[PDB]
Design an enzyme around this catalytic site. Structure first.
Site, PDB file in Angstrom:
ATOM      1  N   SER A 117       1.747   3.946 -70.520  1.00 27.44           N
ATOM      2  CA  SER A 117       2.152   4.477 -68.999  1.00 27.44           C
ATOM      3  C   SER A 117       1.994   5.783 -68.889  1.00 27.44           C
ATOM      4  O   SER A 117       1.864   6.808 -69.604  1.00 27.44           O
ATOM      5  CB  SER A 117       3.717   4.111 -68.670  1.00 27.44           C
ATOM      6  OG  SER A 117       4.116   4.982 -67.570  1.00 27.44           O
ATOM      7  N   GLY A 154      -0.781  -7.835 -73.236  1.00 28.05           N
ATOM      8  CA  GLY A 154      -0.880  -7.905 -71.782  1.00 28.05           C
ATOM      9  C   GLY A 154      -0.337  -6.327 -70.924  1.00 28.05           C
ATOM     10  O   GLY A 154      -0.049  -5.480 -71.649  1.00 28.05           O
ATOM     11  N   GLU A 320     -10.669 -53.249 -65.298  1.00 31.13           N
ATOM     12  CA  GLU A 320     -10.890 -54.134 -66.373  1.00 31.13           C
ATOM     13  C   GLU A 320      -9.735 -54.672 -66.963  1.00 31.13           C
ATOM     14  O   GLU A 320      -9.356 -55.966 -67.367  1.00 31.13           O
ATOM     15  CB  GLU A 320     -11.713 -53.818 -67.709  1.00 31.13           C
ATOM     16  CG  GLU A 320     -11.709 -54.713 -68.913  1.00 31.13           C
ATOM     17  CD  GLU A 320     -12.681 -54.269 -70.047  1.00 31.13           C
ATOM     18  OE1 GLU A 320     -12.357 -53.026 -70.371  1.00 31.13           O
ATOM     19  OE2 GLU A 320     -13.387 -54.873 -70.668  1.00 31.13           O
ATOM     20  N   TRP A 342     -18.865 -55.846 -67.865  1.00 29.00           N
ATOM     21  CA  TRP A 342     -19.309 -57.292 -68.416  1.00 29.00           C
ATOM     22  C   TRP A 342     -20.602 -57.757 -67.952  1.00 29.00           C
ATOM     23  O   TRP A 342     -21.034 -59.026 -68.425  1.00 29.00           O
ATOM     24  CB  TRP A 342     -18.071 -58.210 -68.266  1.00 29.00           C
ATOM     25  CG  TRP A 342     -16.917 -58.096 -69.034  1.00 29.00           C
ATOM     26  CD1 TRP A 342     -15.888 -57.019 -68.773  1.00 29.00           C
ATOM     27  CD2 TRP A 342     -16.794 -58.782 -70.192  1.00 29.00           C
ATOM     28  NE1 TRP A 342     -15.202 -57.050 -69.845  1.00 29.00           N
ATOM     29  CE2 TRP A 342     -15.576 -58.068 -70.726  1.00 29.00           C
ATOM     30  CE3 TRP A 342     -17.295 -59.597 -71.038  1.00 29.00           C
ATOM     31  CZ2 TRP A 342     -14.808 -58.466 -71.629  1.00 29.00           C
ATOM     32  CZ3 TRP A 342     -16.756 -60.083 -72.250  1.00 29.00           C
ATOM     33  CH2 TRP A 342     -15.522 -59.363 -72.737  1.00 29.00           C
ATOM     34  N   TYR A 368     -10.257 -62.459 -73.431  1.00 26.83           N
ATOM     35  CA  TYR A 368      -9.087 -61.667 -73.434  1.00 26.83           C
ATOM     36  C   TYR A 368      -8.130 -61.914 -72.372  1.00 26.83           C
ATOM     37  O   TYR A 368      -6.957 -62.603 -72.722  1.00 26.83           O
ATOM     38  CB  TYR A 368      -9.449 -60.234 -73.076  1.00 26.83           C
ATOM     39  CG  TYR A 368     -10.316 -59.467 -74.070  1.00 26.83           C
ATOM     40  CD1 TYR A 368     -11.217 -59.132 -74.033  1.00 26.83           C
ATOM     41  CD2 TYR A 368      -9.373 -59.086 -75.399  1.00 26.83           C
ATOM     42  CE1 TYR A 368     -12.220 -58.431 -74.827  1.00 26.83           C
ATOM     43  CE2 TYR A 368     -10.097 -58.329 -76.380  1.00 26.83           C
ATOM     44  CZ  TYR A 368     -11.649 -58.021 -76.136  1.00 26.83           C
ATOM     45  OH  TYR A 368     -12.219 -57.268 -77.072  1.00 26.83           O
ATOM     46  N   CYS A 428     -13.586 -57.834 -79.538  1.00 24.86           N
ATOM     47  CA  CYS A 428     -13.458 -56.740 -80.351  1.00 24.86           C
ATOM     48  C   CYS A 428     -12.287 -56.160 -80.678  1.00 24.86           C
ATOM     49  O   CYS A 428     -11.940 -55.631 -81.835  1.00 24.86           O
ATOM     50  CB  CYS A 428     -14.381 -55.652 -79.735  1.00 24.86           C
ATOM     51  SG  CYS A 428     -16.239 -55.708 -79.888  1.00 24.86           S
ATOM     52  N   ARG A 448     -12.214 -54.774 -84.752  1.00 25.71           N
ATOM     53  CA  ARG A 448     -13.064 -55.305 -85.878  1.00 25.71           C
ATOM     54  C   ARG A 448     -14.479 -54.627 -85.940  1.00 25.71           C
ATOM     55  O   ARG A 448     -15.013 -54.368 -86.902  1.00 25.71           O
ATOM     56  CB  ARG A 448     -13.179 -56.929 -85.561  1.00 25.71           C
ATOM     57  CG  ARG A 448     -14.206 -57.147 -84.670  1.00 25.71           C
ATOM     58  CD  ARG A 448     -14.524 -58.618 -84.468  1.00 25.71           C
ATOM     59  NE  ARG A 448     -15.369 -58.963 -83.186  1.00 25.71           N
ATOM     60  CZ  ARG A 448     -16.614 -58.555 -82.981  1.00 25.71           C
ATOM     61  NH1 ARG A 448     -17.252 -58.122 -84.077  1.00 25.71           N
ATOM     62  NH2 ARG A 448     -17.050 -58.907 -81.887  1.00 25.71           N
ATOM     63  N   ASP A 451     -18.308 -49.302 -81.881  1.00 31.50           N
ATOM     64  CA  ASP A 451     -19.323 -48.429 -81.216  1.00 31.50           C
ATOM     65  C   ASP A 451     -18.880 -47.009 -80.924  1.00 31.50           C
ATOM     66  O   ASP A 451     -18.277 -46.893 -79.878  1.00 31.50           O
ATOM     67  CB  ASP A 451     -20.061 -48.940 -80.135  1.00 31.50           C
ATOM     68  CG  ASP A 451     -21.005 -48.185 -79.540  1.00 31.50           C
ATOM     69  OD1 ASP A 451     -21.059 -46.951 -80.077  1.00 31.50           O
ATOM     70  OD2 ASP A 451     -21.372 -48.382 -78.225  1.00 31.50           O
TER      71      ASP A 451
END
Ligand code: NDP
Ligand code: NDP
Ligand code: UMP
Ligand code: UMP
Ligand code: 1CY
Ligand code: 1CY
Lengths: 546, 544
Positions: A117, A154, A320, A342, A368, A428, A448, A451
């Protein structure tokens, strides 16, 4: 050996930044970079009211001192100055910042408070604090004090000048992942001057996710350790693909000390597969690198695990999901919403190669949807009713969670062995298992085939979303979503693009908001889902074929 | 004035001893079990490549930047001066004798013979010698080596141990029996303790591990960053106060725990310390966590728990029973395998609302799903030949004709048949992976009783993996165990606590009659467990 002042006196900077309310009118495609988080304050105070966790972090850093390490520090500072009561850290702040501290907190406890200051002098202060009217004075003061570390706390003016002078060894930067009105900002960090070296886990606090990162100043019992070297004598063989995969292409990724951002669970697997995966070739000829058995855990109560190292959209996967829940197997429903997830698996060519010569185009069979609501029933066609036929697994798990919370038999299984060949392609996501404790729901999904480059990112979002859905209609709070990977692969096509990705540093995850009214798992619609504060890197085409 | 100053260590390797009095099968085991040192001048076993690689790597390793503290401590405590550093290797004349001329002297090591009648005049100028034990301390206080390793022989080890001159004992354990005439001294666990246990390996037709005996005492930049990042973590553990960590004295005292059995043990520990208190379908109590994963290298060992005794005739028969596709409880009961007895009683069946099921008619369980998934279940005596999907037959053909298929799964959780089963299956499925002629298997378990079930479950699927791999002319690789709801019954807490403090032995191995090439052609006599060294049986329900 030109000794750097910030190293001798260990001067660090610690802050927190939120996203700025700047006008993003014109392009719905907002570009993001580290400079996205830079809002420091508003009208003399913090943009956001408060943030308990950030405060807890702040208090912990600026008060922690390591007595034993001081011994050395003292030697260092003394020799630098040619010189031969509980330890505290020093905190330095602008006068405006000091005047924003509530009187019952002045001065900051267990810390040597220093204030910059000109308008005010020591006589103007009642508290036990040091006043200095110039930066150089700080260096002088530090030379005369006994302290552990020095933190610049700060505000914008102070951070600004300390950065120019390169007096900052490191910057403890907190990223609040939400927007607020701001009139003050943190300076744009120079990436050739400062590099990120650590990223923390992601948390939620006061209705916002946030993480902690550390910027470093860019360059330019002791015996038990030998038993370790011995125990690692047979680690003779290393990365089989390290040749084909040059770690030098993961410069940034390998330069990070601490990588605790949950996204790294996904990223480290990509790395592991690339450095140690087995070379194999799947059904069409496309090659892959593969590994077997991995597990990832995401804290849905702290954030929504939507990858940030590339761009992702969830409208399609949500549709989906809603599609699955309705028990549908009609691919057209998705296509009439412009969701093509799909489309390829329902063509004449595809269906015929599956020997489904008697299956109508886009009729995907007992997949599914069909399994979740009618497992065991004989599939006829996608237009058939099936009302009250087969087992409605979905409703069963919902009732088990509501009435028998501790059951160890709450699973949703899609792998109907009998129906496999009638399906466009076997599932999957084999199954989901739920766990309930102290009013919280966790979900485990076993995949299982995985990707990593294209599929997994969406899969993680799908099930995380699904867990939020089940937990809500069962009057519970979502906890963890455990993802188990079986055959984990990386297609050769994706490598170059994944190498790019692994070198991007994660942003704090966004959050998922569900319409709170919905009480039945069947009453959800696309507009009941909101992904907020999704900050991400530019999208990538895992496949760069043109 | 101790034996820690000069850093004198001892490194050896002991096998199991033979007995033309007892034979090959053993009954009570302890550390002393491994003591075979040599036979007729040579080692009991011809040669062990991995151990030799281990030895040559330890007695050759040097850390120049660490010799600092020693030059200090060594000279500073002798109150005298020092008088590319290497390590010292002390041996007996015979020990040195057996060494062949080719590899003599031991490469890169300061060779030393503690012989009596050895003519130093007939050895190198760098091949030091001493007449008495006490004489070693001298040569050392005069040299500037890194460490001193006592590499034998039998007699040499005894003398040194008695004189409390050993700081640490690098003990290699060869889990195989051989003819011996010389042995290692029975280690006194009061003056010597085990600190680290390595991974188990297979080398020269025998498993082995490396453990370390330690004589009982009786940058900084990112270092701090590590602390800031753990600023929100919990101070204590959920049941820390309940289950006292001091009770795991041994478990904690260990620095390096690389033995595979710790994968199981560490989970027992994790659930005990961080597990959530919960009431189950029994009224009894459990501590439970969700989602774990264990991996066992079936090419280096058979993961049959050694921190307690386990039997396998029962589980193998169950396995053979599954393969046959049976659902008939009696078949097992007449062989005294009572694994499913409680689940086949009138009451249990009636509580499952299966009022019309014959006693011991377990319904469409494992065996039925494996060979007839989809077939309508009638009774346990019906002929189901060629009915339903034979998954077992299907996965074997997939492995043989399309190894890189990612659809090789054996699923037992037939949703449609669940209520017709005495009880839903715990082992939901098996997924197989084939690479470079090696077979790996993941098995997902939905409910895991860590104290009583899991141990057997690990043995079953490992065995199954070998079976599958052999009838597919593949070598087994890894058995990956994924646990969903993992729990520890409160009643097992005291026994597991005792188990947690036992140090695992080197795993045994599984041998199958190699002629068996059809999954359906195995019989109980085709399975043999070898060299199973274990701690005594423990009553999981210590509660009597
Ligand atoms: N997000 C975050 O991490 C942080 C946010 N803040 C916020 O930022 C705002 C305050 O920042 P800002 O406006 O820049 O004000 P500052 O806190 O940085 O204070 C600036 C003032 O301090 C004194 N000062 C600074 N440098 C010197 C110097 N070299 N020599 C002498 N005096 C000096 C002078 O005060 P004087 O007028 O008396 O001469 C100057 O006007 C508030 O809204 C606050 O809420 C504050 C800290 C951290
Ligand atoms: N498993 C393992 O780690 C090891 C196994 N072995 C095996 O053990 C057998 C050899 O061991 P061992 O029978 O004890 O023979 P040693 O190698 O221990 O040699 C004993 C001889 O060395 C000299 N010697 C030893 N101690 C003293 C002493 N304190 N003072 C003076 N001279 C001493 C004397 O030789 P001198 O005749 O000149 O008086 C003595 O007769 C072999 O069968 C070998 O295969 C050997 C080393 C390690
Ligand atoms: O939700 C999904 C669906 C599919 N895949 C990937 C995995 C495989 O690369 C391919 C399916 O091939 P198979 O596993 O059936 O062989 O699609 C995913 O990653 N996630
Ligand atoms: O091979 C097996 C079979 C059963 N169990 C255990 C798990 C549960 O403690 C109990 C079965 O009861 P539920 O989980 O189905 O309720 O048996 C195992 O750990 N392994
Ligand atoms: C707590 C807060 C907001 N949080 C962080 N990460 N950094 C600071 N410098 N802060 C701060 C500390 C003290 C004062 Cl007075 C103002 C802001
Ligand atoms: C190589 C071997 C067998 N292995 C171990 N673990 N310990 C010893 N002391 N060895 C040994 C070293 C030298 C000689 Cl001459 C004989 C055995």
């Amino acid at each position: 050996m030109m000794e750097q002042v910030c190293d001798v006196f260990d001067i660090y900077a610690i802050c927190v930044c939120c996203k700025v309310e700047s006008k993003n009118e014109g392009k719905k495609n907002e570009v993001f970079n580290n400079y996205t988080f830079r809002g420091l304050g508003n009208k003399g105070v913090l943009p956001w009211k408060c943030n308990s966790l950030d405060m807890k972090y702040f208090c912990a850093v600026t008060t922690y001192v390591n007595e034993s390490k001081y011994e050395k520090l003292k030697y260092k500072r003394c020799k630098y100055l040619n010189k031969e009561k509980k330890l505290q850290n020093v905190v330095v702040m602008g006068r405006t910042t000091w005047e924003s501290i509530p009187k019952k907190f002045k001065p900051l406890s267990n810390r040597i408070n220093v204030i910059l200051s000109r308008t005010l002098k020591k006589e103007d202060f009642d508290e036990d604090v040091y006043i200095i009217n110039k930066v150089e004075d700080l260096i002088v003061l530090l030379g005369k004090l006994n302290y552990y570390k020095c933190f610049i706390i700060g505000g914008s003016v102070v951070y600004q000048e300390f950065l120019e002078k390169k007096l900052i060894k490191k910057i403890y930067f907190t990223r609040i992942n939400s927007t607020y009105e701001c009139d003050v900002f943190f300076p744009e960090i120079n990436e050739n001057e400062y590099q990120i070296i650590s990223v923390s886990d992601v948390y939620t606090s006061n209705n916002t996710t946030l993480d902690f990162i550390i910027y470093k100043k860019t360059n330019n019992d002791d015996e038990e350790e030998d038993d370790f070297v011995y125990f690692n004598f047979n680690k003779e063989k290393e990365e089989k693909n390290k040749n084909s995969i040059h770690p030098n292409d993961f410069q940034i990724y390998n330069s990070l000390k601490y990588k605790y951002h949950p996204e790294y669970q996904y990223l480290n697997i990509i790395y592991d597969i690339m450095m140690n995966g087995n070379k194999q070739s799947d059904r069409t000829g496309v090659g892959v690198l593969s590994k077997f058995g991995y597990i990832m855990k995401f804290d849905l109560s702290q954030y929504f695990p939507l990858l940030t190292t590339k761009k992702l959209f969830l409208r399609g996967i949500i549709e989906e999901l809603l599609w699955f829940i309705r028990g549908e197997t009609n691919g057209n429903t998705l296509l009439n919403k412009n969701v093509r997830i799909w489309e390829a698996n329902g063509t004449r060519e595809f269906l015929d190669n599956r020997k489904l010569f008697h299956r109508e185009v886009n009729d995907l069979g007992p997949i599914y949807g069909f399994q979740w609501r009618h497992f065991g029933a004989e599939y006829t066609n996608m237009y058939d009713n099936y009302e009250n036929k087969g087992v409605d697994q979905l409703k069963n798990i919902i009732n088990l969670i509501k009435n028998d919370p501790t059951s160890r038999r709450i699973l949703l299984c899609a792998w109907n062995v009998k129906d496999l060949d009638q399906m466009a392609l076997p599932p999957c996501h084999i199954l989901c298992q739920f766990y309930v404790f102290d009013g919280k729901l966790s979900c485990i999904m076993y995949q299982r085939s995985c990707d990593l480059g294209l599929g997994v990112p969406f899969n993680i979002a799908s099930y995380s979303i699904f867990t939020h859905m089940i937990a809500q209609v069962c009057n519970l709070q979502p906890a963890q979503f455990i993802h188990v990977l079986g055959n984990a692969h990386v297609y050769n096509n994706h490598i170059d693009s994944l190498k790019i990705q692994l070198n991007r540093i994660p942003y704090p995850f966004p959050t998922l908001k569900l319409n709170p009214d919905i009480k039945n798992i069947e009453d959800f619609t696309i507009s009941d889902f909101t992904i907020q504060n999704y900050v991400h890197h530019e999208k990538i085409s895992m496949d760069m074929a043109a």
